[PDB]
Amino acid sequence: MWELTILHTNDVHSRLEQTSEDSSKCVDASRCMGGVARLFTKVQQIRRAEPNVLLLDAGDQYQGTIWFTVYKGAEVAHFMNALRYDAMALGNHEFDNGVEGLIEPLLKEAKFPILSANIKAKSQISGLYLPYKVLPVGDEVVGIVGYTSKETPFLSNPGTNLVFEDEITALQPEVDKLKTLNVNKIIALGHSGFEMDKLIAQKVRGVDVVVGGHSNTFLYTGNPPSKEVPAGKYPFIVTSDDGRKVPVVQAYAFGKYLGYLKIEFDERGNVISSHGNPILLDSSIPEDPSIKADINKWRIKLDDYSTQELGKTIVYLDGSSQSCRFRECNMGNLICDAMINNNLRHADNHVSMCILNGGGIRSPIDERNDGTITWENLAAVLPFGGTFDLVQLKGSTLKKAFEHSVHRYGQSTGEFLQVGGIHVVYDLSRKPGDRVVKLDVLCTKCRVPSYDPLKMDEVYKVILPNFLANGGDGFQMIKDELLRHDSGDQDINVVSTYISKMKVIYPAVEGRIKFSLE
Amino acid sequence: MWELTILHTNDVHSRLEQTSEDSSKCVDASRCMGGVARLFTKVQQIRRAEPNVLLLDAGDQYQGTIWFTVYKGAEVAHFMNALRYDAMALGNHEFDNGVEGLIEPLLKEAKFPILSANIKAKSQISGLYLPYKVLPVGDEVVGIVGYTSKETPFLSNPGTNLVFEDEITALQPEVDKLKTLNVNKIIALGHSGFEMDKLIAQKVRGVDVVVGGHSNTFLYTGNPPSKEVPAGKYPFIVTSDDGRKVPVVQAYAFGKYLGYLKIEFDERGNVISSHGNPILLDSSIPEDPSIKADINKWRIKLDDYSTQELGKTIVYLDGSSQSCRFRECNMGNLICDAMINNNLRHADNHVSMCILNGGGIRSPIDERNDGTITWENLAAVLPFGGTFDLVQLKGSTLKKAFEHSVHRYGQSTGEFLQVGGIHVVYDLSRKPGDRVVKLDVLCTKCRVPSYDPLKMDEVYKVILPNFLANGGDGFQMIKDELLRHDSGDQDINVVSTYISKMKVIYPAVEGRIKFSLE
Ligand SMILES: Nc1nc(=O)[nH]c2c1ncn2[C@@H]1O[C@H](COP(=O)(O)CP(=O)(O)O)[C@@H](O)[C@H]1O
């Protein structure tokens, strides 16, 4: 028997410092979690105890906090090198600052192999990322094959030169080449989501284990340690088409947990068994002093975004995925109110309605730090540098959008819409495409605004992110059927301006989105 | 036969200049109405044609616009003298600036008798107002007996020295004294409301006609000329207990109409018949040039309140009685939002709920003048100089208040509540005291504010006018059952500050108050 311990992270999203339990800024240090200093301590503890260890990342280190807005990936390469990661797979967010934003900060400075077998460039990038790497682990070798979401061209900015192939089609020839080289232990490490990960495990002959990301999937065996509810056991077992039991793992997001899987291999590289669980990186684990002092050094340049108080909140600003992708969330209401307020000011075409993809809200903000709101706090909520555009839509188009908002409800997908100037009621007992039971909107062609049923043949002006106006999140009907599209102001500046104007904010959940009982 | 024409006004409330159809500031002069210059032209036209004319006012000339805030009744005495009113009865609003605010500006400068038979002082005021006046009208005499709401001590500030008697009890001895003096034509002129006016007509032996006010009652015979819906025919006929047909008249409010009644008397002063209708003072009647030039002279001092733009509205600000005393009105929502915003700022005890008596909103604001909002526009909405106080109430107390809000619904009474941070649903099919079918409130002891059912044994912090905290509008339960009462900022300054902060406002009717179908 040859035992291998796989340590893994995914969707860290620039949470270099320890955070609050909800992955927002750490205020109460006594109860904070995650961060690269704490992760280091745990990884070192495991490396001291286990002789065959691999520390892997399944992508999306890029984007999420002021660390990335300021260092643009230099902090990723630096701290991933300090933690001595053995390999990383490319995620979609590694392409947000173009191919140039991946090459210079990360690919040229990473001391570990960076992988993706399904990205074919059509050179300069040649060899800076690899389809696989064969890693020596003691007296054995372990092959790691990478993969990246085939949806990256739509989700990010990888440019016209990179081609993204079907993951299964691109992986099988690389795995087969590893098998011809007598590499009998193979890990598929990549960034496509738990559903594709299970398909890779079922269909790619020769893959012994799948380490994934992108869906922020939390898996656990037994009673879980924090607020994340498990989507399945850890590992999730897939029975492959050739009859092998293949463990599939993921470790939520934001560096809150360290994925930990122990695999028992025979002499021919068959998985005899495996077990483990994600480790909660809570205050019980001390932050490594050396890494922490280096974090404090890099932190000095960021304190310019933490000194200006933009305003104050007397309520918890719920920007969590568990709220904003499933129901009305007060952060969504705040952002839509700021969006509506911004246009109802610098017009010289006035608008009363707002739609906002819940997945575009990427962090909550806590009210306990004397309720202070800084640019840094807002940078984690809106880390993409998008704009809030004005569009003219038909009622029929809006109805289709709201049907699309709940067409596959319950999967924590980002299309669920937050709103302003709209009162929507859904009936999830109904069939996809027929779940909107009520859709009232704030009249524009009226002297006193009031809510009236949306009319399919009428025309409404809606403020929304450029992501939705360009057909993102499957909102193809907006891009195809829109009658007008005007570019707007930068997302973060619109919310920043609105908070400074209000001074004290208290957004509520007030019935803009409801669910019927049937 | 001896014919008398009674011309009458009531509840003018400082509308010295012509106004918009809704009695707010005149912007589009082409379609404006009322004002003392237009009234003069009509009164003169009638005086030229009819030999026996009396021009009467049934009170509440005081309070309503910047004219009264600045001239404090000097404009009333001046312009009522210019129009040559024959008599006036004291209304409750004539006592808002104390007895001193009535004596000096009006009683000492009025060239016509000022009347009230049921006000007994317990001197200086002696003879400055009279219980009645016997007026020569051609070769005859007409007795006018005055009366004032017995509720004036609670509604206004008449002081501890004035006693207000039951109107019927005080009137009969004065009418009997007039009959002993062979005065066979008697008009009761007063300010107690249409219901008391009908009782006076039924019960006071010797009264030939009743000219009233206070309830802003619009009466009309036939198809009406504007948006006011008639509450009955003009005149309203009461059959007295001694079997006489007694006409009862009123002429809405704000100087929009001139009440016009022609009475045919026999030689013994019996009313043989009567007929007429309120005359709409619309653009068809020219404004008298002489009065208009004198109005323009007095207007120069007021233009300091019309030059500073506090902000802009892109919606009609519905502060009409027909909206705010019957359903959710967007002016009510604006004022409650300003009330909530004001305390959620200069705390150093935070509060999320607001209640506002609809009768405290005393004018709309139009959005068509490039949407401009001035101090003058706000002065007509909030003309009383009240404050928005903080109170701590039990849920049981709040439930009683909301039951009181609709206990006598449909009478255009001012207790109907406008709200903030509250979602109330009424069922008017239910019995008084049991009409609240749903009462949800914005949680305070929660990190994310949301609406939850009000709990009878819990405690809430509510911002409301001092008028309601002191038990006004029959809200005795607030004054008696409150747990804490902190005095607040001046009503007009709170709304002014909030509009300047927002710059562009667009309050909507959004479902804070609803009515069920049963
Ligand atoms: N450029 C943009 N602008 C946006 O406003 N939102 C975006 C934009 N890129 C994405 N997203 C949102 O992010 C969601 C995906 O988040 P996750 O489920 O955590 C997968 P990922 O983090 O990409 O691995 C999408 O469903 C979108 O709603």
Ligand SMILES: Nc1nc(=O)[nH]c2c1ncn2[C@@H]1O[C@H](COP(=O)(O)CP(=O)(O)O)[C@@H](O)[C@H]1O
């Ligand atoms: N001092 C105050 N402060 C207020 O906030 N509201 C007041 C205050 N005095 C009164 N009112 C309101 O005015 C309403 C009466 O208006 P109308 O029916 O037009 C009779 P009136 O104008 O008095 O002849 C009451 O029901 C109250 O709601």
Ligand SMILES: [Zn+2]
């Ligand atoms: Zn991610």
Ligand SMILES: [Zn+2]
């Ligand atoms: Zn991703």
Ligand SMILES: [Zn+2]
């Ligand atoms: Zn009045």
Ligand SMILES: [Zn+2]
């Ligand atoms: Zn009155």
